[PDB]
């Protein structure tokens, strides 16, 4: 009804992506019909490359190294993939659903959004966490 998210799957990988067993570096799901359920995956970053597609949309969740916060020695963040060739239907859905799975976050630090494959670089998401200081307030919002 309205929208159905299967965060149940991501969850299993969300916190398990921190275990020394599965190893599934990250997991991505895509709006299949009227529900959000696993669609692709990755055991390493190189996969995100054979997995990135400007013609698809999905969220990503990989554990990046922090080399600082001795906390589990590692950072946790989610990434959004907005392909530039998907229908307009799922578009309005991503907005409502991306907020659903986002509220079920309880094992990370911050989420990020992307619009290009070159933006999926590690030095890009790494320098993004080291920031952790939203100050666009003087930007009158966007």
State the Cα angle at 38 between 76 and 109, rounded to 5°. 15
The CA distance from 40 to 44, in Å, is 13
CATH number at residue 95: 3.40.20.10
- The most distant pair of C-alpha atoms in the chain lies apart, rounded to whole Å, by 46
Method: NMR
Structure tokens at 57: 């949309």
Query: What burial class does residue 59 get, using C-beta atoms within 10 Å of its C-beta: 0-12 exposed, 13-18 middle, 19+ buried?
Result: buried
Number of domains in the chain: 1
Query: In what order do the strands lie in the sheet containing 110-114?
Result: 57-64, 75-82, 110-114
Query: What burial class does residue 106 get, using C-beta atoms within 10 Å of its C-beta: 0-12 exposed, 13-18 middle, 19+ buried?
Result: exposed
3-state secondary structure of 63: strand
Please enumerate in sequence order all residues whose Cβ is within 8 A of that of 64, keeping only pairs 6 or more positions apart, or say none: 74, 75, 76, 77, 122, 125, 126, 129
Q: Within 13 A of 99's CA, how many CA atoms are on the CB side?
A: 6
Which of 108, 104, 137 shows the shortest CA–CA distance to 125?
108
The CA distance from 2 to 96, in Å, is 9
Q: Which long-range contacts (CB under 8 A, 24 or more apart) does 110-117 make?
A: 110/77, 111/77, 111/78, 111/79, 111/80, 112/77, 112/78, 112/79, 112/80, 113/79, 113/80, 113/82, 114/79, 114/80, 114/81, 114/82, 115/82, 115/84, 116/54, 117/49, 117/52, 117/54
Domain hosting 93: range is: 1-142
């Amino acid at each position: 009804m309205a929208t159905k998210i299967d965060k149940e799957a991501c969850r299993a990988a969300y916190n398990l992506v921190r275990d020394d067993g599965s190893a599934v570096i990250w997991v991505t799901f895509r709006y299949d019909g009227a529900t959000i359920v696993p669609g692709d995956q990755g055991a390493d970053y190189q996969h995100f490359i054979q997995q990135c597609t400007d013609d698809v949309r999905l969220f990503a969740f990989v554990r990046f190294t922090t080399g600082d916060a001795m906390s589990k020695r590692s950072k946790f963040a989610l990434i959004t993939w907005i392909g530039e060739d998907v229908s307009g239907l799922q578009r309005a859905k991503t907005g409502t659903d991306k907020t659903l799975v986002k509220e079920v976050v309880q094992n990370f630090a911050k989420e990020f959004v992307i619009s290009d494959r070159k933006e999926l670089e590690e030095d890009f998401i790494r320098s993004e966490l080291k920031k952790a200081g939203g100050a666009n307030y003087d930007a009158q919002s966007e």
